């Protein structure tokens, strides 16, 4: 069965830092971009829509502009890594990663934003 797995289901991240949240999917030999969809979402805000290799900045939610990207080097290894720079208090919440690659699946990841002192 096609399964998406998360190495971590909880990330505790510092306010103003950078986070990379990971979502793994099975890759046999080389990645085929023509068969791959990656969708990152957070409480109905669309962060990444990677459709068969194609990304459209116009449909990224305004709260993630210039802060969120899908790391392409990880993608080759079956790792859909979402990097968010300059983490905001509003970035706290439940992220969903949906991967379609042959089959389809999704996982939830909780992000908590701390302000250490």
């Amino acid at each position: 069965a096609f399964t998406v797995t998360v190495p971590k289901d909880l990330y505790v991240v510092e306010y103003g830092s950078n986070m990379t949240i990971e979502c793994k999917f099975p890759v046999e030999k080389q990645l085929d971009l023509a068969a791959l969809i990656v969708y990152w979402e957070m409480e109905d805000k669309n962060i990444i829509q990677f459709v068969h290799g194609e990304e459209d900045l116009k449909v990224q939610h305004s709260s993630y502009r210039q802060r969120a990207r899908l790391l392409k080097d990880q993608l080759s290894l079956g790792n859909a890594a979402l990097q968010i720079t300059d983490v905001k208090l509003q970035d706290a919440g439940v992220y969903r990663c949906m991967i379609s690659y042959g089959g389809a699946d999704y996982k939830r990841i909780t992000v908590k934003v701390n302000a250490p002192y």
Partner: protein
Amino acid sequence: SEEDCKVHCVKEWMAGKACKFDVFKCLDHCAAP
């Protein structure tokens, strides 16, 4: 059969993107007994 239900959720999510379909609810229901 479950695999096929999930592929179809993605199909309908894509169709929507052309034309508010909740793909996570759809995928959930494929796994739901």
